[PDB]
Amino acid sequence: SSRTMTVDTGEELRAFVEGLVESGDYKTNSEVIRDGLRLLQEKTAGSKLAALRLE
Amino acid sequence: SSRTMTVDTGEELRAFVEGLVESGDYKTNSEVIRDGLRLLQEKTAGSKLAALRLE
Amino acid sequence: RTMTVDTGEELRAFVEGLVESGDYKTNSEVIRDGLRLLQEKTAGSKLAALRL
Amino acid sequence: SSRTMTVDTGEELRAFVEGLVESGDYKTNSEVIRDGLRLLQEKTAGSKLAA
Amino acid sequence: TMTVDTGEELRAFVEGLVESGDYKTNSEVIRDGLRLLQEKTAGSKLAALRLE
Amino acid sequence: TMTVDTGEELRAFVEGLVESGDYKTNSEVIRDGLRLLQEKTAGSKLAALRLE
Amino acid sequence: SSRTMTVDTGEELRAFVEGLVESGDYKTNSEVIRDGLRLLQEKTAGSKLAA
Amino acid sequence: RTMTVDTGEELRAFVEGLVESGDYKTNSEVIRDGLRLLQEKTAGSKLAALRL
Amino acid sequence: SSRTMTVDTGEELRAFVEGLVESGDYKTNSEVIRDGLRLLQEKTAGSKLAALRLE
Amino acid sequence: SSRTMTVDTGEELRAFVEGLVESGDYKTNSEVIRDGLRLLQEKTAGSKLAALRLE
Amino acid sequence: SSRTMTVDTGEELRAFVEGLVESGDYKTNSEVIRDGLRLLQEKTAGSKLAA
Amino acid sequence: RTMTVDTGEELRAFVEGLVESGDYKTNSEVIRDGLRLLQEKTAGSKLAALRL
Amino acid sequence: TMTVDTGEELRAFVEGLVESGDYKTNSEVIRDGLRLLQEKTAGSKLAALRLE
Amino acid sequence: TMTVDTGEELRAFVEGLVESGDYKTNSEVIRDGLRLLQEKTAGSKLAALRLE
Amino acid sequence: RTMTVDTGEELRAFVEGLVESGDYKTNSEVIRDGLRLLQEKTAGSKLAALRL
Amino acid sequence: SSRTMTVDTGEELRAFVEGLVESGDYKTNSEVIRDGLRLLQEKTAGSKLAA
């Protein structure tokens, strides 16, 4: 189930991620990245381009 | 400007990310992660909890 | 049945303030309410429909 | 105080949480509860009752 | 018929609703809340998922 | 604390909610309904008219 | 059965109804109650519970 | 206090079916619910704002 | 408070009005006309042209 | 095609109607009443209670 | 100036207008044009360009 | 083809101001634009669907 | 006045609009498109950012 | 290709769009307007009525 | 002025199909349209407002 | 064919792109153009014209 990767987010988006961990809304940097991916995943699923690429 | 990190996304979300690179909508895995973070960033900014934590 | 979770201190403070407001009786009630929101959001999600 | 919490979910809500972990979108049971707590937090913040 | 632990802020909310005069009894307020919850439950995407 | 006349269809609705397991007690269901009603009341334009 | 109904509104709801009649948008107390009943009827018809 | 209104037969049948469903206890409860909807709609209306 | 008028609605809209009285949702033809006027009144009030004509 | 009726609108709604004729948006009182009925007709058609009464 | 206007609608738009009159919802061709002018007036008033 | 209509003075003033703004070339162009709005609104209307 | 390269599919679109009879000339169609673009531009949040 | 009477306010609007630098030529602006009009036309309920 | 970008093959195919449809004249026109969408989305974004 | 493209943006659109890169949300000019192309792609896919 586990799987790591190393990404370049850049400094500003890294600071965004650390701020979210600092707030305690998320436990780890990975959790923040996963929440962002889940959000992008929900947007991809319901996108008209996914509905188009299906038919 | 550049800044890397290593995250655990897990297998299923990693497969989601690779599918987006495979589609050619994105060039790299980092680009996908950055797009997800930008999306989470826009949601955080306009969230009523950011407006509340401000005042 | 019971689940042991790491909420962190800040989210615990959020949970406890919901309890002291009186709108919830217990910490577990607040969590069940949060899980009901997520269950409804998950079920109605476009990704829910796509996976089926 | 504690960063750890033991919650009476009942078997059905527990089965819901374990399913999201099985689906691989969440890594741990804890991550699922935090996601639902974040939803509730945003809702209570933007509630007209909070205003 | 039914006895429920509301806590006293929720009791105050209900009594305030009766004091406004939009409601006649405490029981009317609880029925209204449950009708609200019943409508939300029925229209839930998760109730659509379970009994489409 | 509070005793309310729900009628028995409303009782069945509540018990069905407890039977689903999204809720632990009948009291939790009524609290949830009242939180729903409390949020709607507070956000009412009429509550904005009375206490803008 | 009856086309007539006697309703316990309480003084505040009664004051609301008499105000709409005073405002001239409604002619009678009855017209106000029918307007509110029409609202409830449309809501219950289009309720997901009605589906 | 009590008001005597002409609802007509069909709207009475609507009121009574709401009562037999059990979601409401009395005919007067159904009417108060209808008047609460209209009060909220009136208060939030653009014509409400214009008149003040 | 009372005030009558005689209007030409035409046949089709008259049939619409009578159908609404027949349904019992309304007691009289006047009630139907008044409900229609209240609806047109609420639309006029919140119309951007009423907001414009004000300033 | 033509068809008259005499309605009691009351004073306040009559003043509303005359104001709309005075503005020149409508030529006659009948036109105002007809516009109100068309509006109520469109609302009735798409109402869930018309969809329910159909099935 | 004039309360009367002669408009080049073309046959298709004219057929649209005569149809609304045939349907009985409008009494005259003029009433139809005023209804469309009222729509345009509301749109131009509430246009962000008008702000 | 041509239609002779009674617009009244005020609506004529509205039509003519649209022409002097330059967004429309002729009085008839403004009217055709108004009729296009009404045609689209009519076609999409719930009463359009009901009649068919 | 103005000469523009539309390409011939866009020319066909315009001529089709004139053929429907909702429009009288090709120029009317282009004016309508530019009014559409003018309204969108004015209401743009970016036009609000530049000239709030 | 196509020559159109825009009037000079509409010409100014187009040239202003080219002056902003979001657009390169006057022709690009007109194409953009026609794409806007083409999308609105296609999605029209009246285009759904004619070619559902 | 000119910018050299890595679009990848698939997005190029998307750009070129937009050009062959005739709705756009050049590959650069398609890109400017994409950048106008992003500029408008950026300017209106809640994060735009927060940063100022 | 080419994965590379040279685009006439003009200085203003170029300044817009370089600004998003300066803001650190995007790493490269290319990433910005792909983001805008993704927006256009979703819009054209879900266009009623595409249906």
Numbering used by the authors:
A (entry chain C), B (entry chain C), I (entry chain C), J (entry chain C): 2 to 56
C (entry chain A), H (entry chain A), L (entry chain A), O (entry chain A): 4 to 55
D (entry chain D), G (entry chain D), K (entry chain D), P (entry chain D): 2 to 52
E (entry chain B), F (entry chain B), M (entry chain B), N (entry chain B): 5 to 56
From the paper:
Recently, PrpTA was found to be a pMBL6842-encoded type II TAS with the unique function to regulate the plasmid replication in Pseudoalteromonas rubra. In addition, PrpA could also competitively bind to the iteron sequences in the ori, interfering with the binding of replication initiator RepB to the ori site, thus preventing the overreplication of the plasmid.
PrpA2–54-form I and II crystal structures both contain a doughnut-shaped hexadecamer formed by eight homodimers organized in a cogwheel-like form via inter-dimer interface dominated by salt bridges and hydrogen bonds. A circular hexadecamer (∼112.58 kDa) consisting of 8 PrpA2–54 dimers could be found in both forms of PrpA2–54 crystals. The maximum diameter of the annular doughnut-like hexadecamer is ∼80 Å and that of the hole in the center is approximately 22 Å. Apart from a type A-D dimer, either B or C could further dimerize with its symmetric mate generating type B-B# and type C-C# dimers (# represents symmetry mate). Since the dimer–dimer interfaces in AD-BB# and AD-CC# are similar to each other with an overall r.m.s.d. of 1.05 over 144 residues, only the AD-CC# interface will be, thus, discussed at length here. As demonstrated in Figure 6A (left), a functional PrpA2–54 tetramer is defined by inter-dimer crystallographic contacts between RHH domains with positively charged DNA-binding surfaces exposed to the solvent environment. The AD and CC# interact via a surface that is electrostatically complementary and somewhat slightly hydrophobic, especially the interface formed by α 2 helixes of PrpA. Salt bridges and hydrogen bonds below 4 Å are distributed mainly through the α 1–α 2 turn and α 2 helices of molecule AD together with almost equivalent parts of a molecule CC# [Figure 6A (right)]. In addition, the interface generated by AD and CC# dimers covers a total surface area of ∼1100 Å2, which is a little smaller than that of the dimerization interface. However, the inter-dimer interface of PrpA2–54 displays a novel feature that all monomers could participate in the formation of tetramer suggesting a much more extensive and strong contact.
